[PDB]
Amino acid sequence: MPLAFCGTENHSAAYRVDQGVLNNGCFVDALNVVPHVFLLFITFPILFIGWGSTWLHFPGHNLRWILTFILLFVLVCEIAEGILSDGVTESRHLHLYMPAGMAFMAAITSVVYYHNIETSNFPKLLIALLIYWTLAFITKTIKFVKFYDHAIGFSQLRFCLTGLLVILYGMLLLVEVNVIRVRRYIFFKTPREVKPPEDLQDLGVRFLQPFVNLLSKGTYWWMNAFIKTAHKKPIDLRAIAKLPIAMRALTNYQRLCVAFDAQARKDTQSPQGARAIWRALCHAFGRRLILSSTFRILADLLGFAGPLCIFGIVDHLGKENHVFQPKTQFLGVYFVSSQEFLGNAYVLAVLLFLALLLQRTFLQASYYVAIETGINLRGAIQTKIYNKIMHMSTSNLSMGEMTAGQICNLVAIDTNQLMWFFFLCPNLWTMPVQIIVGVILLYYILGVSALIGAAVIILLAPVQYFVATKLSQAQRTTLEHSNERLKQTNEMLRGMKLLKLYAWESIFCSRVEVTRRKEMTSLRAFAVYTSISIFMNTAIPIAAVLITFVGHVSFFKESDLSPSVAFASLSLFHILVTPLFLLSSVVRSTVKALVSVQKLSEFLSSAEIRECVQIIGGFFTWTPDGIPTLSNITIRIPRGQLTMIVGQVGCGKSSLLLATLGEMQKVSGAVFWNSNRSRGPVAYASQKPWLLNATVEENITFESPFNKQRYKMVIEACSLQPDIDILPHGDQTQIGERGINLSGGQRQRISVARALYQQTNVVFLDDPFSALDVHLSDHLMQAGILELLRDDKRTVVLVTHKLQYLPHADWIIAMKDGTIQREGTLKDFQRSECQLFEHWQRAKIPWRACTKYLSSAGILLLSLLVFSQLLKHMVLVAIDYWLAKWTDSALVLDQSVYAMVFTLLCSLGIVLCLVTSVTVEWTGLKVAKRLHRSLLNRIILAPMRFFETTPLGSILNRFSSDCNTIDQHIPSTLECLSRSTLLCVSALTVISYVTPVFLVALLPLAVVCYFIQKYFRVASRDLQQLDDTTQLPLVSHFAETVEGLTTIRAFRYEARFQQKLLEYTDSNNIASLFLTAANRWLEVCMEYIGACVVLIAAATSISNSLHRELSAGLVGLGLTYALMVSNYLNWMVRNLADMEIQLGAVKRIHALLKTEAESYEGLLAPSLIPKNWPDQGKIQIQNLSVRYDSSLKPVLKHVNTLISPGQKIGICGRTGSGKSSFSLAFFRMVDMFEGRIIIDGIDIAKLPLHTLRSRLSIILQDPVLFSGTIRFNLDPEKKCSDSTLWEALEIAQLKLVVKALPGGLDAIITEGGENFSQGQRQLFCLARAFVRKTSIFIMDEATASIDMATENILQKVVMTAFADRTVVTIAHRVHTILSADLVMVLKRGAILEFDKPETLLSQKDSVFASFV
């Protein structure tokens, strides 16, 4: 019985060349052997030379690749037929499965060869490949025609398979000659030559997926070298790719505008938009969305080709493996019948493997195509929105502010949810087909009990739909309650010094905590209504299986257990269960999408703007019909001029200025225009100022080149170099909104500086000296503006009421009654009775997450949580093994015992799922509660120096957003991770128990999964942060656009901001595309790992059940867990990345709870120190030397100075050195590192800081009123009496507002007293000074106030001296601080001057020098 090469039967009678040379059936296989080893032996040196820049794919190569893939498929099928035929006979018959194997290796090498000949564009070297292709085409044609001459027919399998790969070689020979025809290299005198694409020619595009071969489009191979690059260096934005041509937002915008033009030509409906959006979106994006849907439909169909293989495997493995032989026997060769082919065991396993390996690639490809179309939708639709921002009128809208906030939220939420609709759009095409084919083949598998189970799953989607609706309602109510909570947090982070100064931390912490616990009750209801979603989500399959098997056994009594049917039914149940919960969310996303398209359509058909200086006819309005708001305007202003304008208060100044800008709907009239009919870049600066959220030099230069001379002149004229030094960066500080909070004169001067700077042939100033109330600054600015515009020789127009210069030396223009009266000389206004006014890197977080779970849960519930999760997964393992054992023991024939224990295990499963769903929400609720109370308590017990050190933005961000993350993001991610990784460990444990060879094949596979997980985590964290920090400047740009719109359209500088918008949108979309494609590459890699798990498990299970005779119920339970392992890895990796990103805002929350200082410590005997404390006023400071960080510069040194009782020593000094330091340390609010600080003769070094800040009143520089009730705005901690509050709020100031208030002492302080006064704040300060029996009152100077307000403050200080008589005031306004008793001038941080009489202060040198 030796090693025969062809066959040893009949004593080598197949080695007989008689009866023709070609009619020997083994000789034809030798002929088919020939071309493959010919290609191997001519293409091995080529490939080895190759293995020892620029890419261009050959024309028509995608169908080349797909024909190669399907010929690999049919060659694997012929390998299977060859194995079953050479395996049935007694001999070896090696001529049945050697030629197919060498053909498989030849096809693999000829596609590697095609890739290595696609890398180097040298087409004359695939002539050999074409000479390969005709030879095999000839040879298998011979084989097919010999089957036809031997009359096999379509009955046997190998005839059909042979004809199939004949037409394979024919079609790829036709592809080869199509390439020959196109590129014209071999026999043509002139070869066609193509160039690499411009996206390749950029070299600044790494994301080369739209221009790469089809295998890398399928498996994302180019991502690998990217993701492995990301482990050495992190992924910067410069490391990211450019926005290539097919994905450039301008190009997609052009395509979308072509769609708009095509739709608007065919329909042209003016009050439409919705149908217009429908036709435009469909015509513009169907060419990719339908392709994504097609791949998704094919992936769904090949997904449902999974349980059929389980059914065939378990049905043949249950039927004893009796036959194992083909019927047909032609010429001593056994031909496999196709039923016996598709009835084999190993063959069906390999077919299952290749079907899963194509299903679970087309699903991810469909995902990716949907994502790419969604990102191009986001790009083009945001670009269209910005284009209709670039023409939108403001006064044709009433609420132009509320609508610009609306349109920014519109852009963000609307465009994002339109993007999310085009993410989820193939689901509404496939999930119905998924469910329908699932119901159909589940009825084919099992029966009417499967229809009962399908009624369970079809009655588990409306429950999720209704639960998500109630959840969204609860989330709305929770967020609109937590908005008030966040407003309370903003009111608690703006006033740290004022609340610690007025001893108002405890009452405001309680007023925050009451709203927080109300929001916590609302969040508890939210957690219940989102726990019930998880409970229904995790108990619908258990009830489905229970009702299914209970129907088939108890209710049907039709057939046996049918384990092939059972495990196919279970796998069908999982494959049907997965889309079902997703579809309710899809329908919700569709509803949100329709609302979003309605919103953006009602936006898109809003009013546009419009289609030397001279205006003749004069009618101009805002409303597009009726009432011209500025008419009779006949004014001419040629170049070389400086027209001052004038008028009454609100007499049409900004209306005339905007009418000169061309931003008003001019009904009657003409606009002559001539630049030294098209419009020029008129410079403008509105009444309301505006600054881009950028640097101050960036808000000054305004996208223009930078010279030192004009910038120095603008910093000098507007007094900006002291303003630059007032900021810690100057020309680098983030000016305006989202940055350094400026002042109105400073912002007006910066806007005027950019207007003056912008080098224009005209300059419009719509009252710049209106808000800059610094008169000497305004006069120096006016003179420098006159000098600059005279030395620049450019036309100017200043429309204001500053009549100090307007009748003197201008070519003025006067607007009377909202119309132009006279634009001439000053003598005409001295002749129209108008001169009377003119003569007047970390990996993970494991410590912080452990600290969170430890300090949050408590082991009596953390143990219960882990135990309930483990018990639920053990119960699911138990129900699976009980189903397997019951289906096995019913086929081999206590059946009611099996059904009863199956029902009582499904009930325990449902109960444990309810328990885990309760436990997750309860753990998250207690976590958020105790973490919030810890953060609030640690934020109360803080010094004001920490609030000086760290900003409120960082504290508020890691407060609010991390509270949101630990309130609405951490419990769901924890539930998903704790179900996904535990289901994964359960399934792989079950696979290893059923197949004990699996763990041996698991360990290298798990190592590969761990390394892929590590590199994906490293890349995905950085791409997530790059997504967030790229989508932030885009809405920042939409804010700065909608805010200063008329300035941009005034400058005619729209195209540069259009390009800045397009650059911002491209930089956001490319990061979104990298995050999408990294997610999809992760899912593809883990899905091939799962397919190899399926292959090894199925192979070893069928091998040990053919021979070792396994309890084949366990084999089907193995395959249906290898499939659910296969998607448990997906959720495991995704939930691990989400838990990493969500736990990063809690590592920071714990880190900001780890900053505690300013401990209240009364170390004396507190029984007598704050009762004696009121009304003495005797705080004798004895050499108390101060420091703050105790680093480089103490201020107070050995200052042994006393304030006498009654002697209200207003002691002002140098405000840089000795004013504020003593005023801060007087209230024990600084580090007096030595000395002795007495307080009315008591020890202020051991006082209760609650009691110390209670019985020592103060005044402020920028005073503020804490929002609340009027009794809570006056004295919340005291609440003494109403008549005392009337006496305070009467005798200080504001009596005619307090008695005229709607509430009285019980009225709402409207968020700081937003329109009360600024002296009403000082009146409340005097109220708190008069109410708390406070003799002392530590005062600082007013920053900005009126002289009469300062005189009223002096009169109130006289009344405070008449009622309290103790005061210590420091004032950089030294000229009003002179009415005192004693004074101290503390220059350059020392105790330099002290004058206990006031006349010695006016007598001595330095104090009088401080008085001048």
Ligand SMILES: Nc1ncnc2c1ncn2[C@@H]1O[C@H](COP(=O)(O)OP(=O)(O)OP(=O)(O)O)[C@@H](O)[C@H]1O
């Ligand atoms: N962009 C706009 N949005 C809304 N209303 C506008 C707009 N432009 C002009 N109007 C209307 O024009 C009318 C005139 O306002 P007005 O002309 O007094 O500006 P102004 O005289 O420059 O104000 P001020 O005297 O404070 O500088 C007002 O009713 C105003 O609402």
